[model samples]
Structure formats: structure tokens, C-alpha cells
Target: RENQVYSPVTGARLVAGCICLTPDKKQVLMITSSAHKKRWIVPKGGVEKDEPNYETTAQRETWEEAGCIGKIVANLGTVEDMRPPKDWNKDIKQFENSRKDSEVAKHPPRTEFHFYELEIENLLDKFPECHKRHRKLYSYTEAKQNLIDAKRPELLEALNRSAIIKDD
Candidate 1:
């Protein structure tokens, strides 16, 4: 469905995602960004009309983006992305490389991400976006750096909000 849900209070699109963690809780899962090969991001996207709730959307996105089936055991809270959409007719990296610096003058279609803490049950041999994206595991410190290098502080914030990871 094209009609993605948005928050009434902030006008930000309601997005859902998760940090799929290892069994020992020492590492977090990350996926190669669809927009760029070198950059990594957590599984997240806007809620579709058919999804029942944020939890469903988060689990669906995790499987779709990272090929991982997981359970949402807790929430990592919400974070905001001030960057507008970057659909590209040109090279994808050209746009992703722009990061969060450009497009300040225009009104940003900010997105509100409702992130959750997901416990991985299995990793599928194939899943949606598998051809376009790759999955990786990173320690807490390494995961934070990857998000920062990707210029995705919003994701970093979500990772930081994890209670399990915070126990480290």
C-alpha cells in the first residue's frame, strides 16, 4: 500500500524497525543499505496499510531486509529522521553520500521511527532484498561507528536505547 501511516502530532511518517540481537546479546545485526553498498543500516521502513501494528511492521521489515525471523521483545523507543526522501534517477551513492547536510531550505518530510528490540530465531537462506542488500553482525561499539559513518545518527540513537545492549 502506498498510504504509509504518519503521526498526527508531528506530521512525521510512522516508521518501524528493530535491532536483531545475538543470543548472548553482545552483537547487533545490520544490513547493507539499499542505497549504498558500503553503508549499513538497521531494518526499517514505513508502515503499510495491511500491517496490524508497529510490532508487526518491525518484524516484517527485519525479515525482509535482513533475512532474519525474530520476535519483538522490547522497544528501543522512537527517533526522528529530519532527512527527506532521496529517490534517485542518478547514481544511488551520489544521493546517499549527500548524507544529512543538504536540503535544509525546503520543508523536510521527517520520519518518526518506532524501533524495537528483536531476538533472532533464525536466518533464512533467501528473503526479500537479499539480492540488493547484505547482512552483517557488529559489536555494540562497532555498530555505533558503522551507523555514524553512514551518517545515520537516528539509527545510532535506536541502538543506544537498547536495554540489553546497555547491559554491556
Candidate 2:
């Protein structure tokens, strides 16, 4: 499942994300998605043509969105979705309609995320997107509960399978 090709019907756009954990593994870093401010997600972005490596993309996104620096520990896995949760599109549309000239209206309907586990070494108070996004640290339970997307369960499973998050 890790190397499956995206079907034409799926139209999965490639994205890279990081499951960023503190060095002690007690806390996970999560950021709010720009499309909907209340929905929490890992730091992620679309793979650009200039960036041929998924790991690099993941690192770049982590730095940009969460203002954290880290090294990739392991490839957590891939999550391919036909679409986000039902209301996500409505939310995106609402956001775009309000802006009228927003670039988010051009997003694809499907996405395939290449997720990696990153051990965060530094958390900065300022970064490229510090003013645009909100970030917070969450314990395992809080992280699981705060993720309000359709892929929340899958992400929690990935975290568990990585062995980086454990019950205390």
C-alpha cells in the first residue's frame, strides 16, 4: 500500500507531511489547516515541481507551517483519500467565495499524503507562516482528540505503529 500508484479516477495530488514528536515523545506538534482554521492537521503541503523528494517536502512543510526543525526518523506511511471530510469542501468553498481571488479554489479534490515521523529538535517562535497559522503541542490523547478530519483515526494509527507515541 505504500507504493501504490494513484489511479486516474482518484486524482490524488501528492502531498508530504510530518508527524512531528518532541524528543521525549510525550508531545506532538500540530498546526491548524489554512482552509479551515479550526481543523487541526500535521504540517503538510503539496509537493512542488522543484522538490523531487518527499522527505524534503515534509521537512520544508514542517518548518513553514509549524515553525519547527527536525530530521526524518522514519516513513510513517501513506494515506490516500478520495476527498476530505464532507464539510471540508463546503468550508473551502466558503473561504474562497469570500476572498473571490483566492488561490485555494484551485485545489484538487483528492490527495495522497506521504507521511514521515520527524523528531523535532527545535521549536521557533517565528517562521515564514507564524502569523498565518496557529500551532500547539499536544499529548497523544489530545492530539488524537484534536484532529477533526476524516483521516484522524488513520493518523493516530500511524502514530501508534511508528512506536513513537506510547501510553504513559
Candidate 3:
């Protein structure tokens, strides 16, 4: 029998993250996703109930995931992934089937990521998630090349829109 898919509690998933720029504004910080170590992405996570605001959530996620502390310089933009892959649904089904009573089976069907520009002030050698994740610094060009899903254009547009990276 196919396990029943659980419904999302919040109906919509809202996440907060940042495109962190180094002090000189020459490079950006990127971290690998735990599920796929080779896939690079900005530090981000689900919005928590205790968090006061979206910016705070962004800051906390960046600090916890990337081992960086900084101030939010600007609201870069938002990205919506309305159509997730069919594989995700299959995975969810498999997971639900495995743990029929698990409450964690419920996850938001759609994700909306709010991006911000963080002016990075310091980076720690050791962080909460250092062992689980790999972090790196990349130049604008390098970052653009390394990002998954060819999101470089959208990211660049967001940064430009926020005036975080000006054109020559």
C-alpha cells in the first residue's frame, strides 16, 4: 500500500537567507548543502516560530550554517520555487511509508526564500555546523559558476537591484 502523503502545517514555507559579501566586497560566502555536499547554496533555513523577524532568521541561519556573523546591508530579493521536482514527492512518499507515525513527514509543499545582502564582518574557524557542512569563499565570477540550478542570473539581478553590487 502506498503511504499517504502528509499535508503541510503552514501551507506555505517561508525561508530566509543571505548573499554574504566579504569585507572588501570582492567575494561571497557559499556553503554546501548537507544532503548534497557538492551542491553549493547560500546559507538559509526555515523560519522559526521564536524568531522575531525575517532578517533575524536570515542572520541566524547564516551564522549557524556558514559560521559567519554580519549585519544585514539590504533586502536583496525573493525567490519562489513553486514547482518542486517530482522526485521530491517520491522521496516524501518513501519517507512517510517508512515512518507512518512520524510527525516530521509534514513539510511545506512550496518554498519562498527571502534573500538579503549581509556585509560579513567575521568568519569563525569552527562553527555549530562546521563538521556537517563545508564552507568556502568565492569571487563573483566563481560563485556564479559554482551555484546550482544556474541561479546566477537571478542572484546577480537581486544584488544589483539592492545596490549591493554596482555595475562598472
**Candidate 2, superposed: residue stretches over 4 Å from native:** 1-9, 84-109, 149-151
lDDT on C-alpha atoms for all candidate structures: 0.83, 0.76, 0.72
For candidate 2, write residues 1-168 as lDDT tens digits.
344234366567788888888888888888887878888777887887677688988898899899999888899888754434556655735344444455434444477778898998899999999988999988887887776463566566556655465585
lDDT by residue for model 1 (1-168), tens: 667988888778899999889888888989988778999889998898788889989988898889998778887888888775555345344333245565333444589999999888898979988799989888888898899999999989888878546544
Indicate the TM-score of model 3.
0.71
Order the numbered candidates by TM-score, best leading.
Answer: 1, 2, 3
Candidate 1: residue 86 lDDT (0-100): 58
Over the full model, what C-alpha lDDT does candidate 3 score relative to the true structure? 0.72
Best by TM-score: 1
Query: Candidate 1 clashing pairs?
Result: none
Ten-residue stretch with the least lDDT total in model 3: 1-10
Error of 1 at 28 (Å): 0.4
Ranking by lDDT: 1, 2, 3
